[PDB]
Design a protein around this motif. Structure first.
Motif, PDB file in Angstrom:
ATOM      1  N   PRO A 315       0.836  -1.185   0.000  1.00  0.00           N
ATOM      2  CA  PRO A 315       0.000   0.000   0.000  1.00  0.00           C
ATOM      3  C   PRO A 315       0.878   1.245   0.000  1.00  0.00           C
ATOM      4  CG  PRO A 315      -0.332  -1.358   2.004  1.00  0.00           C
ATOM      5  CD  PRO A 315       0.935  -1.771   1.344  1.00  0.00           C
ATOM      6  N   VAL A 316       0.597   2.165  -0.915  1.00  0.00           N
ATOM      7  CA  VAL A 316       1.538   3.257  -1.129  1.00  0.00           C
ATOM      8  C   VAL A 316       1.531   4.267  -0.012  1.00  0.00           C
ATOM      9  CG1 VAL A 316       1.977   3.129  -3.581  1.00  0.00           C
ATOM     10  CG2 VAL A 316      -0.091   4.255  -2.762  1.00  0.00           C
ATOM     11  N   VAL A 317       0.440   4.255   0.777  1.00  0.00           N
ATOM     12  CA  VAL A 317       0.361   5.107   1.944  1.00  0.00           C
ATOM     13  C   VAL A 317       0.305   4.200   3.142  1.00  0.00           C
ATOM     14  CG1 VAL A 317      -0.633   7.153   3.023  1.00  0.00           C
ATOM     15  CG2 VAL A 317      -0.974   6.776   0.583  1.00  0.00           C
ATOM     16  N   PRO A 318       1.457   3.639   3.543  1.00  0.00           N
ATOM     17  CA  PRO A 318       1.449   2.442   4.392  1.00  0.00           C
ATOM     18  C   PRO A 318       1.048   2.681   5.833  1.00  0.00           C
ATOM     19  CG  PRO A 318       3.691   3.188   4.077  1.00  0.00           C
ATOM     20  CD  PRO A 318       2.816   4.150   3.317  1.00  0.00           C
ATOM     21  N   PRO A 423      13.954   2.205   2.545  1.00  0.00           N
ATOM     22  CA  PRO A 423      13.977   2.051   3.990  1.00  0.00           C
ATOM     23  C   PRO A 423      13.404   3.173   4.832  1.00  0.00           C
ATOM     24  CG  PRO A 423      16.150   2.661   3.148  1.00  0.00           C
ATOM     25  CD  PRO A 423      15.314   2.243   1.988  1.00  0.00           C
ATOM     26  N   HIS A 424      13.922   4.371   4.641  1.00  0.00           N
ATOM     27  CA  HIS A 424      13.561   5.437   5.525  1.00  0.00           C
ATOM     28  C   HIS A 424      12.426   6.269   4.994  1.00  0.00           C
ATOM     29  CE1 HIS A 424      15.965   5.304   9.102  1.00  0.00           C
ATOM     30  NE2 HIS A 424      17.060   5.047   8.413  1.00  0.00           N
ATOM     31  N   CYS A 425      11.910   5.884   3.850  1.00  0.00           N
ATOM     32  CA  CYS A 425      10.788   6.590   3.315  1.00  0.00           C
ATOM     33  C   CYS A 425       9.509   5.922   3.740  1.00  0.00           C
ATOM     34  CB  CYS A 425      10.925   6.722   1.813  1.00  0.00           C
ATOM     35  SG  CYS A 425      12.375   7.716   1.413  1.00  0.00           S
ATOM     36  N   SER A 426       8.856   6.549   4.697  1.00  0.00           N
ATOM     37  CA  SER A 426       7.502   6.249   5.040  1.00  0.00           C
ATOM     38  C   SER A 426       6.796   7.602   4.991  1.00  0.00           C
ATOM     39  CB  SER A 426       7.429   5.604   6.417  1.00  0.00           C
ATOM     40  OG  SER A 426       6.168   5.865   6.954  1.00  0.00           O
ATOM     41  N   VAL A 427       5.726   7.624   4.222  1.00  0.00           N
ATOM     42  CA  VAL A 427       4.770   8.693   3.910  1.00  0.00           C
ATOM     43  C   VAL A 427       4.296   8.081   2.608  1.00  0.00           C
ATOM     44  CG1 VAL A 427       4.318  10.848   2.672  1.00  0.00           C
ATOM     45  CG2 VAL A 427       5.423  10.988   4.831  1.00  0.00           C
ATOM     46  N   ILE A 428       5.212   7.941   1.644  1.00  0.00           N
ATOM     47  CA  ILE A 428       4.948   7.253   0.402  1.00  0.00           C
ATOM     48  C   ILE A 428       5.841   6.021   0.372  1.00  0.00           C
ATOM     49  CG2 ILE A 428       6.681   8.067  -1.228  1.00  0.00           C
ATOM     50  CD1 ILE A 428       2.998   8.484  -1.811  1.00  0.00           C
ATOM     51  N   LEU A 429       5.274   4.893   0.008  1.00  0.00           N
ATOM     52  CA  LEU A 429       6.058   3.692  -0.049  1.00  0.00           C
ATOM     53  C   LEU A 429       6.653   3.660  -1.436  1.00  0.00           C
ATOM     54  CD1 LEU A 429       5.137   0.017   0.552  1.00  0.00           C
ATOM     55  CD2 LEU A 429       7.132   1.341   1.147  1.00  0.00           C
TER      56      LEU A 429
END
Ligand code: HEM
Ligand SMILES: CC(=O)[C@@]1(O)CC[C@H]2[C@@H]3CCC4=CC(=O)CC[C@]4(C)[C@H]3CC[C@@]21C
Length: 442
Positions: A315-318, A423-429
């Protein structure tokens, strides 16, 4: 009885935050408190806890918090996506949601069809060449949202290059660590930040874009009739709903509707590169039904199941967006005090072996009819459901449907693209950069 407190602080430092968050369910269950940054926050890691919060106790968990960046993005006008739950917010959502549904009812389906048609022809130019697809899906979905929000003036005054460049700047700045760290460690606001000034410049450029577009619609508009989404929204306006509301609803459409859907598309490609049995099966299903219209969805059951799987597993907005408790309430027989921030771990919840057996495997047939398992929720649920979900599900169908019939997807070179998310990108997967080869015919 509060939800169990997980030990440690600055859990933020963990790469794959949603998968690390799923890891803590090991000791603490689906619902627990933990310290991201400084703040105490409860996290939900199951479809039961998420639906119990978001759907059942509908209004109890429909709010948003207000850290620095939320104020900073909406210093002039009220934002919808980052707006707290109120009467005025509810009217705000209703209008823009009616703009997407009724306003562009006749044009949404053709605009998508036509723009992805020109995407496939641009793909046609270089037949063997490895293509950095990511950017090409990004230009497509950005064009689609731009045409549907702003109209003909986009391909006329040739606004797509400048708008894409702006929409990208805005999200890319905001989601970067140098900006996000201020929301969790608010004392960092006093220490100087290039990043926040890189952001303000982006806000200024996006506001100049939307406002010039707003004037131009207003001056040309006809009182009964509506060409695009801003035409519809301008007409349903003037605590009353103001033109400032329209302005931000466009901002949310633009920024919300490029990278999300485009990356989902990118992920689907990578999955098909790893599963060429499925690609052939999908192609042969398409051959058996010269486009497929969205009205004929049922006629491609494996294609739909493949899309459902991409959404489940990636899911792109995880982590959705943060939620705030509106009144004192309870989830899963724990007391949830007012104003406590809720993180709805969607990526984690979709990896549940209770609900989806063999949950780590890309297995589309899983969603097929005998013993079909429960529906995933990549778009979230409740009052805060993704606004542009209908537009997204259409974009996903038309684009994959035409890519697959017209082309075959081959790997960039020798080795398959990495399936592991940045790895460190969470907001957009987002996935590790990749190229793909498109060869006619499917
Ligand atoms: C595959 C594509 C997409 C996925 C997976 C997706 C997912 C989400 C999720 C998970 C949320 C937050 C839910 C929550 O707060 O509980 C969200 C919010 C939102 N999305 Fe999307 N989205 C997609 C495409 C779009 C598109 C194309 C648009 C606009 C054109 C859009 C506009 C929004 C807006 C405006 C919100 C905020 C709504 C609110 O706060 O109540 N999204 N989306
Ligand atoms: C899926 C999602 O969560 C969204 O794409 C749906 C709505 C999106 C907002 C919309 C407005 C905005 C204005 C800015 O200038 C900075 C970036 C944000 C906050 C932007 C980021 C990603 C969001 C939150």
């Amino acid at each position: 009885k509060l939800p169990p407190l997980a030990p440690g602080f600055l859990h933020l430092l963990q790469p794959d935050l949603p998968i690390y968050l799923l890891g803590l369910t090991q000791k603490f269950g689906p619902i627990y408190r933990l310290h991201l940054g400084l703040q105490d926050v409860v996290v939900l890691n199951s479809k039961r806890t998420i639906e119990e919060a978001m759907v059942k106790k509908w209004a109890d968990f429909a709010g948003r918090p207000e850290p620095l960046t939320y104020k900073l993005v909406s210093r002039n006008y009220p934002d919808l996506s980052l707006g707290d739950y109120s009467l005025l917010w509810k009217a705000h959502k209703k209008l823009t949601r009616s703009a997407l549904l009724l306003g562009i009812r006749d044009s949404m389906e053709p605009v998508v069809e036509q723009l992805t048609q020109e995407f496939c022809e641009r793909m046609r130019a270089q037949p063997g060449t490895p293509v950095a697809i990511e950017e090409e899906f990004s230009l497509l979905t950005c064009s689609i949202i731009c045409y549907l929000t702003f109209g003909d003036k986009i391909k006329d005054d040739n606004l797509m290059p400048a708008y894409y460049k702006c929409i990208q700047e805005v999200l890319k700045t905001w989601s970067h660590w140098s900006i996000q760290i201020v929301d969790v460690i608010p004392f960092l606001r006093f220490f100087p930040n290039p990043g926040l000034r890189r952001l303000k410049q982006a806000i200024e450029k996006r506001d100049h874009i939307v406002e010039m577009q707003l004037r131009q619609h207003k001056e040309s508009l006809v009182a009964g009739q509506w060409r695009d989404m801003m035409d519809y929204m301008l007409q349903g306006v003037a605590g009353q709903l103001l033109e400032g509301h329209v302005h931000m609803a466009a901002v949310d459409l633009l920024i919300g509707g490029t990278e999300t859907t485009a990356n989902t598309l990118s992920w689907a490609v990578v999955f098909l590169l790893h599963h060429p049995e499925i690609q052939q099966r999908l192609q042969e299903e398409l051959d058996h039904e010269s486009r497929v219209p969205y009205k004929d969805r049922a006629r491609l059951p494996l294609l739909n199941a493949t899309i459902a799987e991409v959404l489940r597993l990636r899911p792109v907005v995880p982590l959705a967006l943060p939620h705030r408790t509106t009144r004192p309430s309870s989830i899963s027989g724990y007391d949830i005090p007012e104003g406590t921030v809720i993180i709805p771990n969607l990526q984690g919840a979709h990896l549940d072996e209770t609900v989806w057996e063999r949950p780590h495997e890309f297995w589309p047939d899983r969603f097929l009819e005998p013993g079909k398992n429960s529906r995933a929720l990549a778009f979230g649920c409740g009052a805060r459901v993704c606004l542009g979900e209908p537009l997204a599900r259409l974009e996903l169908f038309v684009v994959l449907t035409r890519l697959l019939q017209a082309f075959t997807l081959l790997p960039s070179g020798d080795a398959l693209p990495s399936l592991q998310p940045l790895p460190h990108c969470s907001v957009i997967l987002k996935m590790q950069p990749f190229q793909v080869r498109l060869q006619p015919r499917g």
